[PDB]
Short mmCIF file of C-alpha atoms in Angstrom, two decimals:
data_model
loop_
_atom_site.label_atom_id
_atom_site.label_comp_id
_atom_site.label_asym_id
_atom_site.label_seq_id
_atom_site.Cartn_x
_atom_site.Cartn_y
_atom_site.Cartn_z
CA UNK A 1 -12.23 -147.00 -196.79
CA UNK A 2 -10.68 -144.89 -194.38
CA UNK A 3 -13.29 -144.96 -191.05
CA UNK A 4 -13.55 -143.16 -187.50
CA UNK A 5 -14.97 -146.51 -186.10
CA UNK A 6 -12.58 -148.60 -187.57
CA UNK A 7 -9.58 -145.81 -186.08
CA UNK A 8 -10.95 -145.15 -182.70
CA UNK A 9 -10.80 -149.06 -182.45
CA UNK A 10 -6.93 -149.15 -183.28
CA UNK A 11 -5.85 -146.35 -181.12
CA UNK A 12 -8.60 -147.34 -178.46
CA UNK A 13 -9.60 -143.32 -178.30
CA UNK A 14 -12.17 -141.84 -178.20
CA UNK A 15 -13.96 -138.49 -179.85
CA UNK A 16 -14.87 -135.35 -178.54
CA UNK A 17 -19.13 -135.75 -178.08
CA UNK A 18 -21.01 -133.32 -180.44
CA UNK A 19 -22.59 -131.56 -177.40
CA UNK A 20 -19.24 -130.01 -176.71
CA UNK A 21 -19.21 -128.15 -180.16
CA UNK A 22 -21.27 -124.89 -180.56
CA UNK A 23 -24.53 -126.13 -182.89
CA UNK A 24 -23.14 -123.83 -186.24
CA UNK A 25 -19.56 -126.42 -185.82
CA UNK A 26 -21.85 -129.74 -185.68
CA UNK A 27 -24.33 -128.99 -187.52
CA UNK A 28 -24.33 -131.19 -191.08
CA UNK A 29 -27.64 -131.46 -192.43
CA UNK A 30 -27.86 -128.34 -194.17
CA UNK A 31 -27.29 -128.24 -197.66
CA UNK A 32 -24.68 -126.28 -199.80
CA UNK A 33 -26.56 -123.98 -202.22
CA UNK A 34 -23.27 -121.81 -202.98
CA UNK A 35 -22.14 -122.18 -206.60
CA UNK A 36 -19.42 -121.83 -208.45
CA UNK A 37 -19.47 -118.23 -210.03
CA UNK A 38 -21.97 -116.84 -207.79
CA UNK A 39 -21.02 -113.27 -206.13
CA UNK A 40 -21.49 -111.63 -202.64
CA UNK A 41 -20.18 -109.33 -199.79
CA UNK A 42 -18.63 -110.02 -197.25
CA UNK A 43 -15.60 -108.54 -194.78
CA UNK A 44 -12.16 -108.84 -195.02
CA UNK A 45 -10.86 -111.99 -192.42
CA UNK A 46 -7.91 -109.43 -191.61
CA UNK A 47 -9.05 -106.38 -192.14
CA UNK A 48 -12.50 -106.86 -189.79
CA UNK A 49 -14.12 -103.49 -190.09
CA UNK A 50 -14.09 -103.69 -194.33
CA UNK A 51 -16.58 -104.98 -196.61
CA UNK A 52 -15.66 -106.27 -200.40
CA UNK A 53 -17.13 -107.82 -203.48
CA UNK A 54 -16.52 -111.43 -203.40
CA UNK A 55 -17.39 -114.67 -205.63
CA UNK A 56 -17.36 -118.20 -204.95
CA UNK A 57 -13.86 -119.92 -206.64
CA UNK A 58 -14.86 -123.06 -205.10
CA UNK A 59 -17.36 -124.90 -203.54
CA UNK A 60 -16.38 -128.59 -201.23
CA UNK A 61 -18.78 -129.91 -199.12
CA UNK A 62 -20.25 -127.12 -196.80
CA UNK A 63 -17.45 -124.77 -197.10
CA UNK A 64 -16.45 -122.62 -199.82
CA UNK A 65 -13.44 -120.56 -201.42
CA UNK A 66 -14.24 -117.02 -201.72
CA UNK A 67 -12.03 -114.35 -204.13
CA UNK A 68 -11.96 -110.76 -204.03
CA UNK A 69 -13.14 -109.60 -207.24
CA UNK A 70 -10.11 -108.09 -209.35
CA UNK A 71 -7.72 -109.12 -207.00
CA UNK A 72 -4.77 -111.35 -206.95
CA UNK A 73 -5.86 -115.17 -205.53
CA UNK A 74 -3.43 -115.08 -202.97
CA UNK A 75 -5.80 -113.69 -200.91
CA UNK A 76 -8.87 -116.31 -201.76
CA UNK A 77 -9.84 -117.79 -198.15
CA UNK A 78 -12.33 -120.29 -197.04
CA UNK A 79 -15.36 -120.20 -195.39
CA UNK A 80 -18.57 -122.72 -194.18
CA UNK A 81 -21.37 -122.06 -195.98
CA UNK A 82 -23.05 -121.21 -192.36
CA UNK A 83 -20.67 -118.12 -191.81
CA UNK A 84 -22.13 -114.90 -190.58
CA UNK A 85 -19.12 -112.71 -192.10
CA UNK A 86 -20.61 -112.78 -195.94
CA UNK A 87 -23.61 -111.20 -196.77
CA UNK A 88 -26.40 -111.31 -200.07
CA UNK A 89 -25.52 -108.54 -202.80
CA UNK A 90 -27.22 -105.31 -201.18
CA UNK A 91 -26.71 -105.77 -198.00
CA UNK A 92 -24.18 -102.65 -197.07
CA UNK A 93 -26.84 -100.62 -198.69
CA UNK A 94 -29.35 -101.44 -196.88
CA UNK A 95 -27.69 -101.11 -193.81
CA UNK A 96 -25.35 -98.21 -194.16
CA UNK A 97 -21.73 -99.52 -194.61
CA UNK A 98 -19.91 -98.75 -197.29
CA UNK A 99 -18.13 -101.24 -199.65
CA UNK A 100 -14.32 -101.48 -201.13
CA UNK A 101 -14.72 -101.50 -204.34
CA UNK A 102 -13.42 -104.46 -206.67
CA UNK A 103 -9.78 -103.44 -208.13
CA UNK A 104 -10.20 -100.92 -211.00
CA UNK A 105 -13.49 -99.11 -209.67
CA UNK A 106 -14.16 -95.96 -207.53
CA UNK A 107 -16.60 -96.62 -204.95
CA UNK A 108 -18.91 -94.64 -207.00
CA UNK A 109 -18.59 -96.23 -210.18
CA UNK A 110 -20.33 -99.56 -208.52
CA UNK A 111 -23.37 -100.82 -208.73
CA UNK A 112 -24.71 -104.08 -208.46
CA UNK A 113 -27.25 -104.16 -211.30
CA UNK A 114 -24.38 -103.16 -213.74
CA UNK A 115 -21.93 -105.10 -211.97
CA UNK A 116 -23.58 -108.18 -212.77
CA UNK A 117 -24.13 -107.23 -216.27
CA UNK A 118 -20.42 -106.46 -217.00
CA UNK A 119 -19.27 -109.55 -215.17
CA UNK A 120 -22.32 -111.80 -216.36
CA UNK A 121 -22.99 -113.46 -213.17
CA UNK A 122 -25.68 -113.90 -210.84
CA UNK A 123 -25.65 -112.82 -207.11
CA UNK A 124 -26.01 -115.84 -204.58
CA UNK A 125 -29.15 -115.88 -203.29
CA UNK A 126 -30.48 -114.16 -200.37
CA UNK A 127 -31.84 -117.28 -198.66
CA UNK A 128 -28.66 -118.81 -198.08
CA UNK A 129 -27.43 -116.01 -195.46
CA UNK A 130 -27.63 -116.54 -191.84
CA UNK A 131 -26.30 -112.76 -191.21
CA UNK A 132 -28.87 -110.24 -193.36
CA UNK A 133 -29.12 -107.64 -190.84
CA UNK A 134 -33.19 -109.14 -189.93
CA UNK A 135 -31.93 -110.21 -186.72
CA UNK A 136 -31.88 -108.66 -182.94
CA UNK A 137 -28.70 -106.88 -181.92
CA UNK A 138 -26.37 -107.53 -179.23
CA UNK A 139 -28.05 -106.77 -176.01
CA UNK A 140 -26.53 -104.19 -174.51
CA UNK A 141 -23.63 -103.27 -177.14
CA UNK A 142 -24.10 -99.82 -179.45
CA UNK A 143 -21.56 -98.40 -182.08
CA UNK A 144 -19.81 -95.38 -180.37
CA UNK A 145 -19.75 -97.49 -176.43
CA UNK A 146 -16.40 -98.05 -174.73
CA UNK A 147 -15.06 -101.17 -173.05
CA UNK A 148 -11.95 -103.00 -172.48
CA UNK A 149 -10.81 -106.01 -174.72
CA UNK A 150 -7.82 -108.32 -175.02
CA UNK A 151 -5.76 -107.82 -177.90
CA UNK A 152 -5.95 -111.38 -179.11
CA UNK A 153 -2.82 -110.87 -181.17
CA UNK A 154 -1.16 -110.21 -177.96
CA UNK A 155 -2.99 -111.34 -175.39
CA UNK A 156 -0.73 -110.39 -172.69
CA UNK A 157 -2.67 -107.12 -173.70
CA UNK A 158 -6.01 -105.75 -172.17
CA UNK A 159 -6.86 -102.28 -173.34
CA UNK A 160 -8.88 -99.50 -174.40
CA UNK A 161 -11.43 -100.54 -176.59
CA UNK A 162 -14.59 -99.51 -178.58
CA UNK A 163 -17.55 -101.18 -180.53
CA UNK A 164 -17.54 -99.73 -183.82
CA UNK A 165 -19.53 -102.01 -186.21
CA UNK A 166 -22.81 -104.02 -185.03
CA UNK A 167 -24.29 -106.89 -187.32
CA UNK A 168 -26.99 -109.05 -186.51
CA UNK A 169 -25.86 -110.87 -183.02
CA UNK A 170 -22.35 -109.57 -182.90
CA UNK A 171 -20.32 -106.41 -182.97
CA UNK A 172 -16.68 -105.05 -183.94
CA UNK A 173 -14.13 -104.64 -181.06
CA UNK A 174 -11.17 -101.68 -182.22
CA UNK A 175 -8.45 -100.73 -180.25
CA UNK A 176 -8.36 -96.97 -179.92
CA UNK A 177 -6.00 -95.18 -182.29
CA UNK A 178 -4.94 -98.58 -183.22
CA UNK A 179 -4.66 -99.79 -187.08
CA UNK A 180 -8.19 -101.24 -187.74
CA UNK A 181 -6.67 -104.85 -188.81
CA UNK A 182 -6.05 -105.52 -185.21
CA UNK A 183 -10.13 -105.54 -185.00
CA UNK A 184 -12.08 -108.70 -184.35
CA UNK A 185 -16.15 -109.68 -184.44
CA UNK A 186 -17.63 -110.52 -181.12
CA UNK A 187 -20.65 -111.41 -179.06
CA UNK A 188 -21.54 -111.02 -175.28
CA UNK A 189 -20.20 -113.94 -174.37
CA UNK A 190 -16.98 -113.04 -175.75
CA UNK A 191 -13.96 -114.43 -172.86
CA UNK A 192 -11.89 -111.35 -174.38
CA UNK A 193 -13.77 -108.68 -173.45
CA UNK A 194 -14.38 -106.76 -170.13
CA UNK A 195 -16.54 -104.17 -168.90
CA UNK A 196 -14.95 -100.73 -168.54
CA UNK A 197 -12.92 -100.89 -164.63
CA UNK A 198 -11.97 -104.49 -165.39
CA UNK A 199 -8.46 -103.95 -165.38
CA UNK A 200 -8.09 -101.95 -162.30
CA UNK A 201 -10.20 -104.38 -160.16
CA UNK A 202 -8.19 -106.80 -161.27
CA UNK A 203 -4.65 -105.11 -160.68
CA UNK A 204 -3.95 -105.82 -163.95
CA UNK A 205 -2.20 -103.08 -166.62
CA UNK A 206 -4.51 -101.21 -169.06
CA UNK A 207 -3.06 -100.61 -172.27
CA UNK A 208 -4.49 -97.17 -173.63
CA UNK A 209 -5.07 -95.57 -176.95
CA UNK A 210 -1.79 -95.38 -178.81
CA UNK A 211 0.25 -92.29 -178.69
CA UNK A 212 -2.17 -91.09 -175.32
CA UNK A 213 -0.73 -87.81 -173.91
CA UNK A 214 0.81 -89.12 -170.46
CA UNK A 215 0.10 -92.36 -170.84
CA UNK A 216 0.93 -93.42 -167.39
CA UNK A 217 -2.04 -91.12 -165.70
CA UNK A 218 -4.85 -92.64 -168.06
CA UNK A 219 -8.12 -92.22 -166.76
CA UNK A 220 -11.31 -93.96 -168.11
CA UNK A 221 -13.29 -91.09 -166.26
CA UNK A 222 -11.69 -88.22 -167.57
CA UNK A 223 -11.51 -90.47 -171.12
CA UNK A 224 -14.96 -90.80 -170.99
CA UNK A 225 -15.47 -87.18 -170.51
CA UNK A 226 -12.98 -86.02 -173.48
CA UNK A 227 -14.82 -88.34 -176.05
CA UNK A 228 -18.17 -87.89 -174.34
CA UNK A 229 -19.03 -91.83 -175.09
CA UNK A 230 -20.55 -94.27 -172.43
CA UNK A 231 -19.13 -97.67 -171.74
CA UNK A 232 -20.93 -100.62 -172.47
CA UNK A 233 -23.02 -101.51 -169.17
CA UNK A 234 -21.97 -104.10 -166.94
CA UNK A 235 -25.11 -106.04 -167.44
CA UNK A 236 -24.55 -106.64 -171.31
CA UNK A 237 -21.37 -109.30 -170.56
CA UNK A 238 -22.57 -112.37 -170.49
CA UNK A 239 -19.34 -114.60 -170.49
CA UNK A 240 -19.81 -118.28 -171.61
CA UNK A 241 -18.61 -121.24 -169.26
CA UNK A 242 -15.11 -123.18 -169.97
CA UNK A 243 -15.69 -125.78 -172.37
CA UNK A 244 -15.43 -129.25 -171.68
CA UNK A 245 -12.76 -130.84 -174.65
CA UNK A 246 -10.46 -133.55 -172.59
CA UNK A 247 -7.07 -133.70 -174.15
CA UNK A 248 -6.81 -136.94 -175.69
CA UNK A 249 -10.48 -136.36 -177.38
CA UNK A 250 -10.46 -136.54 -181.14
CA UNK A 251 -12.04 -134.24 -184.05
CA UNK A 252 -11.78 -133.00 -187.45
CA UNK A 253 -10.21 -129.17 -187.62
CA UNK A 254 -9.04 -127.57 -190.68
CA UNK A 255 -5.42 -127.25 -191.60
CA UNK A 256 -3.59 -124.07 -191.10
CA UNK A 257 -1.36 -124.48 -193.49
CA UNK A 258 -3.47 -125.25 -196.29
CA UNK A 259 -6.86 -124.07 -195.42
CA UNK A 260 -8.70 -126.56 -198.31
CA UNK A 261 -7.75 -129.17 -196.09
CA UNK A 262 -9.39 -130.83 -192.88
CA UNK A 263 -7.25 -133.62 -190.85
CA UNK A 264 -7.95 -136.03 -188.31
CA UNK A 265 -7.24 -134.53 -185.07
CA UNK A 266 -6.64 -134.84 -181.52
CA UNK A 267 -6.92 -132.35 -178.33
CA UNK A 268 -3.39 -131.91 -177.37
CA UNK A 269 -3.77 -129.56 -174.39
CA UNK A 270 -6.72 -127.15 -173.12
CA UNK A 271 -7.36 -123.61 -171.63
CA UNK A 272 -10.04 -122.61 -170.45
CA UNK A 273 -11.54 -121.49 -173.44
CA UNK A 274 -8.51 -122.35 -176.46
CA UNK A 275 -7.46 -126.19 -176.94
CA UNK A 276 -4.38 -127.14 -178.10
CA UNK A 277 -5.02 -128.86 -182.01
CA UNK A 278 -2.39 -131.93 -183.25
CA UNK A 279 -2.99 -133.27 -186.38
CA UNK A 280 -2.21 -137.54 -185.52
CA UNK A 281 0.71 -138.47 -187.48
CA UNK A 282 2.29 -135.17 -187.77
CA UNK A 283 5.19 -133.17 -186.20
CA UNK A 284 4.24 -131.41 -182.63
CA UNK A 285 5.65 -128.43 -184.58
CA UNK A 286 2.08 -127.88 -185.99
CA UNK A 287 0.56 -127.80 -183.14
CA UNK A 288 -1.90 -124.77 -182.24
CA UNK A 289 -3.82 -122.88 -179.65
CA UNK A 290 -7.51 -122.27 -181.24
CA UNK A 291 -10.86 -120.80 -179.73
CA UNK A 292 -12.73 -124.07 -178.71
CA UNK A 293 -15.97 -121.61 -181.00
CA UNK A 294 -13.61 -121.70 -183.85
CA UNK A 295 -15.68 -122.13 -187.06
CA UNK A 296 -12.83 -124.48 -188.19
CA UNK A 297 -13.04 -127.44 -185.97
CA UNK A 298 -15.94 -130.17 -186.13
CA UNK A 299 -16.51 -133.19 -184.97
CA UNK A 300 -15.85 -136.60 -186.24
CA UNK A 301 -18.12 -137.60 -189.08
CA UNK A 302 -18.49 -133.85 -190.29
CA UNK A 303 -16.55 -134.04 -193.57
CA UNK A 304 -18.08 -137.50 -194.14
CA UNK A 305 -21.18 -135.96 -193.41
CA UNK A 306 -20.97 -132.84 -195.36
CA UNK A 307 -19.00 -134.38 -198.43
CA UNK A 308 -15.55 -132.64 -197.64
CA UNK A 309 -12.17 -134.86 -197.88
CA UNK A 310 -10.92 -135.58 -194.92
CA UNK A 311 -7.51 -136.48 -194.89
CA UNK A 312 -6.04 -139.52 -192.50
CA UNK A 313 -2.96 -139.59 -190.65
CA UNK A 314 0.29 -139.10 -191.87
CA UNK A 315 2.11 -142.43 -192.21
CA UNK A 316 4.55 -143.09 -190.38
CA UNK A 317 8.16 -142.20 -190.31
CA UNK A 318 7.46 -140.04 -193.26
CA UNK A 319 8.82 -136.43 -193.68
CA UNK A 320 7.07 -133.90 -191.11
CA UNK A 321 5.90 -136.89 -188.53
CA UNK A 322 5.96 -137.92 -185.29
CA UNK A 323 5.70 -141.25 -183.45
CA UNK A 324 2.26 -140.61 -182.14
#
């Protein structure tokens, strides 16, 4: 019933053209092969630099509920079944990293062949992974090589940073001496990230390691020295170009709130590289900043497309609106 013709033709909008989108957010021919039951690795959305257990709780369209195995479902999230943070069964193995074990176990009391004989399931298959470690690596960016990186929690915040995980085409940003959740996945063309000097050719602060003796006199030289790593060449950033969303344009993003949902929505505002998400018929208190390469937002027709829900516009004058 519900259509994006027959609603771009009421509100006389228009939507944000698929060439704007990164190919992994538009793409929609690809089919689902996740299934219910089936387990994998993969890392932990907030906790970046660790890998667990995980098995598919649900499966809608091309994106999928994942649970850590033995752990409380509060901590289920979602995922497209295109996502280069999960991984086949095997995978840390074969490329050094070690696993968190599902609740109950000691890292050494896993195994995979067992732990698909006590849990009688299968392991998804190992065709369905985009990230499988058979890939080239980041040009240019090595576990151990320094760099400085804007804390995208609090991006006021450029500081002291170092790649400490590589997978495939991207690698692990960590702040030094900082908890590890503050971590984030990145590629070259990362806007966040800055080649070591950045800050002072800029005039901007540096934030150092925490706790660093006399903070005020850091000194990436002497830094450099005293940890005796190398900073990722200069070469190796490869910054992408602003993106080109209009505010007004419309799209499909998934809700915040309730991440099994995906909502009509419109650009509200724009950064260079962030726009501003509304979801049309609801309060500007939901409103968001997101990366315009967010894995979450798609555009028109991709839930019709895939075979997700997509839910219409709140009505109006109902609870949480606004007279959009």
């Amino acid at each position: 019933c519900w259509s994006w013709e027959s609603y771009l033709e009421e509100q006389k909008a228009i939507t944000a053209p698929v060439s704007l989108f990164q190919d992994s957010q538009a793409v929609t021919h690809n089919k689902n092969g996740f299934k219910l039951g089936m387990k994998l690795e993969g890392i932990d959305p907030q906790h970046p630099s660790m890998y667990f257990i995980l098995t598919v709780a649900e499966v809608c369209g091309y994106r999928l509920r994942l649970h850590f195995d033995g752990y409380s479902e509060c901590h289920d999230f979602w995922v497209n079944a295109n996502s280069p943070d999960i991984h086949p069964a095997g995978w840390f193995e074969k490329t050094g990293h070690k696993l968190q074990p599902p609740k109950g176990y000691k890292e050494e009391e896993f195994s995979w062949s067992q732990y698909l004989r006590s849990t009688r399931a299968q392991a998804a298959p190992k065709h369905l992974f985009v990230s499988q470690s058979h890939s080239p690596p980041p040009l240019g960016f090595q576990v151990g090589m320094k760099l400085e990186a804007v804390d995208r929690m609090n991006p006021s915040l450029v500081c002291v940073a170092s790649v400490t995980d590589v997978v495939d085409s991207r690698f692990l940003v960590h702040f030094d001496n900082w908890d590890d959740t503050y971590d984030y996945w990145c590629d070259p063309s990362s806007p966040y990230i800055h080649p070591v000097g950045w800050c002072q050719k800029q005039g901007k602060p540096l934030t150092p390691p925490q706790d660093y003796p006399d903070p005020d006199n850091f000194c990436w030289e002497k830094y450099l020295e005293e940890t005796g790593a190398s900073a990722v060449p200069t070469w190796a950033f490869k910054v992408r170009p602003p993106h080109s969303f209009l505010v007004n344009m419309k799209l499909e993003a998934v809700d915040r709130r309730n991440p099994a949902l995906i909502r009509v929505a419109s650009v509200e505002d724009v950064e260079d590289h962030r726009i501003k998400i509304h979801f049309d018929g609801w309060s500007h208190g939901y409103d968001f900043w997101i990366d315009a390469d967010h894995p979450d937002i798609h555009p028109a027709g991709w839930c019709s497309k895939t075979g997700h829900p997509l839910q219409p516009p709140l009505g109006p004058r109902e609870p949480s609106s606004a007279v959009d």
